[PDB]
Amino acid sequence: HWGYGKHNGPEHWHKDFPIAKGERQSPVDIDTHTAKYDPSLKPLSVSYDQATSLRILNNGHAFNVEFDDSQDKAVLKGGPLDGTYRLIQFHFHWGSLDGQGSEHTVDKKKYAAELHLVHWNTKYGDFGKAVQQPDGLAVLGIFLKVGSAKPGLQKVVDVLDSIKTKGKSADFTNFDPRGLLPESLDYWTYPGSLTTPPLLECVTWIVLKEPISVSSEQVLKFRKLNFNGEGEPEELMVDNWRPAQPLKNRQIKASFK
Numbered sequence: 001h002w003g004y005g006k007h008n009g010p011e012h013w014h015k016d017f018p019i020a021k022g023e024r025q026s027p028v029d030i031d032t033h034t035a036k037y038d039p040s041l042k043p044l045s046v047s048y049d050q051a052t053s054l055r056i057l058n059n060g061h062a063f064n065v066e067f068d069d070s071q072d073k074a075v076l077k078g079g080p081l082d083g084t085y086r087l088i089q090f091h092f093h094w095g096s097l098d099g100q101g102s103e104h105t106v107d108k109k110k111y112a113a114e115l116h117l118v119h120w121n122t123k124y125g126d127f128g129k130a131v132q133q134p135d136g137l138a139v140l141g142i143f144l145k146v147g148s149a150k151p152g153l154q155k156v157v158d159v160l161d162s163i164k165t166k167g168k169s170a171d172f173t174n175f176d177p178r179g180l181l182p183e184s185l186d187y188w189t190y191p192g193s194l195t196t197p198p199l200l201e202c203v204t205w206i207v208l209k210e211p212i213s214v215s216s217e218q219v220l221k222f223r224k225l226n227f228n229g230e231g232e233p234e235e236l237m238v239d240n241w242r243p244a245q246p247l248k249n250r251q252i253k254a255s256f257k
Ligand SMILES: NS(=O)(=O)c1c(F)cccc1F
Pocket: 001, 002, 003, 007, 008, 009, 012, 013, 014, 015, 016, 017
């Protein structure tokens, strides 16, 4: 199966997922000087007050914090989006060292990690239907840099010892994802794809300009997770990021002047 190693990583994915070489792949480098303010963007609304987290899962690639998306409880609206997008899960991508780990880059700069809050367009009824549509998903991306600790991340960090290996899950109720957001909602947006197989071109990306700070100790705990299953030789879960892909016939728009 696909992964991040030398023999099954991003440079190999195209052989089973030919869309890997497609016209709107993600992530991309965000050239901050070429990105243009877009007055047609509406105010962005992140409405997570009633979010219901359920479970945290090590899926062998990353860990997902899953939400009850059976009804409109945490949603994303506004900005570039037409209609209502429901939060289904969040996860991260990170590096083996602080100097890499993000998927998007900013003027070629790599951050230590990147948080993805994944939402599906409720007009399509379910996630599987949404990923058949050009506007099926919206992913809110947030960069992580290493400095002061992020208090709202600590509950995540502290459960990771219980989901060390692929296929393990744990209860993760009553987690507030609002504690993972920076102060500012300034953002860049562009049309793209899932960054892992199946690489489907369904995503409106909304990437916040302001990174959150996390402590070295917090990201070191991410790096103690395992790609492998229980009992198998240890492969540390690190460098689970896809590099930037060609921008092709796209423009990145900014929410800020
Ligand atoms: N294309 S891919 O990354 O999914 C892949 C490989 F490259 C190699 C082996 C199995 C496999 F699934």
